[PDB]
Design a protein around this ligand. Sequence first.
Ligand SMILES: NC(=O)c1ccc[n+]([C@@H]2O[C@H](COP(=O)([O-])OP(=O)(O)OC[C@H]3O[C@@H](n4cnc5c(N)ncnc54)[C@H](OP(=O)(O)O)[C@@H]3O)[C@@H](O)[C@H]2O)c1
Ligand SMILES: COc1ccc2c(c1)c(CC(=O)O)cn2C(=O)c1ccc(Cl)cc1
Ligand SMILES: COc1ccc2c(c1)c(CC(=O)O)cn2C(=O)c1ccc(Cl)cc1
Length: 315
Amino acid sequence: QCVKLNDGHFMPVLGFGTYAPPEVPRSKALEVTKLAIEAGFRHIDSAHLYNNEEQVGLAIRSKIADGSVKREDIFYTSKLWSTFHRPELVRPALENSLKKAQLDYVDLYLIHSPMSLKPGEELSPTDENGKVIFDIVDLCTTWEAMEKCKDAGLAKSIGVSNFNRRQLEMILNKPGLKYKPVCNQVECHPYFNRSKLLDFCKSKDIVLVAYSALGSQRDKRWVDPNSPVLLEDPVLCALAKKHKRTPALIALRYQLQRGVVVLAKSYNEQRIRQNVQVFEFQLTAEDMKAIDGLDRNLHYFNSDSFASHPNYPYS
Ligand SMILES: NC(=O)c1ccc[n+]([C@@H]2O[C@H](COP(=O)([O-])OP(=O)(O)OC[C@H]3O[C@@H](n4cnc5c(N)ncnc54)[C@H](OP(=O)(O)O)[C@@H]3O)[C@@H](O)[C@H]2O)c1
Ligand SMILES: COc1ccc2c(c1)c(CC(=O)O)cn2C(=O)c1ccc(Cl)cc1
Ligand SMILES: COc1ccc2c(c1)c(CC(=O)O)cn2C(=O)c1ccc(Cl)cc1
């Protein structure tokens, strides 16, 4: 149940999302990642940003030691945070993630976001007016350093996240490009299905990886309070009744059948185990077109301040 990436490696089409807000104890990450592996998840999505690589790395270590899986069975993703876009900072950032997770390599390393921020120790650098400080970096130089990370053996594959078509093309058209990004991890769900970006990605043999595929965690820091709740969508719910599944399963299956690799975050054992059932049923072609009609250009991640970033992807 994997897709072949354009560098020859394989990515499981269903991945476990690991981000949880700060109110969630860090020990939970450890617990639930073990449950996910136990439930059958093999693709695990983390990031320096998430303050959990240590716990996720431990879960993997633990499941390897008890014989449940081997390292080669696990597909582990980390991401370069935006304060580390300057080329000389890329490898050290990766090495730090590897040290935290106690891993020798990541299966996939991504540029988390094209919106570069001031280099430093703060994840969100702010000036004396409390305004977040942008940085200007040629992402092609960042990519060059990512390429060196793949050659250094520290990342089996490299890709990007939250890039738009133009931004993807800047990398694809870079003089002397060695490695195309294997994927672009972007917000993708029935209310923002990214069909045009998906088509482009396919034409370039780049995998689109969907996040907030279940409608996001509706975190107060970036959600629109008035935005509809994805999993309460009448069409999704009617399809769930028809197939005797759940709205979540319909949403995940939607992505699988359109050739999208899909992430699913849950810190709940039963929902974690429910989510792997996505391989148990099929949506009809008519089902798929019906879901396609739900698109409303709705992103669950909003930021007025970042909307003014020169590399804001949604402009
Ligand atoms: N590259 C990026 O910038 C970026 C951005 C966002 C996310 N991501 C990645 O993608 C992952 C998932 O995206 P997401 O964090 O926005 O959350 P999500 O996958 O859209 O899931 C959102 C919520 O769905 C609930 N849920 C899960 N399974 C369910 C089920 N079977 N039935 C009903 N509800 C269910 C979970 O609550 P419970 O925990 O209570 O089950 C979760 O909080 C993240 O964890 C992260 O790894 C990356
Ligand atoms: C403090 O916690 C944070 C801070 C920033 C975050 C996130 C979480 C996430 C969720 C995750 O990756 O799971 C995305 N972020 C982004 O910057 C982002 C960048 C570009 C776009 Cl278009 C959307 C989100
Ligand atoms: C504590 O460290 C961080 C780092 C990055 C953060 C944040 C917090 C927040 C929450 C807040 O600032 O209130 C948003 N961020 C983003 O970059 C962001 C950019 C674009 C979008 Cl669409 C969403 C989030």
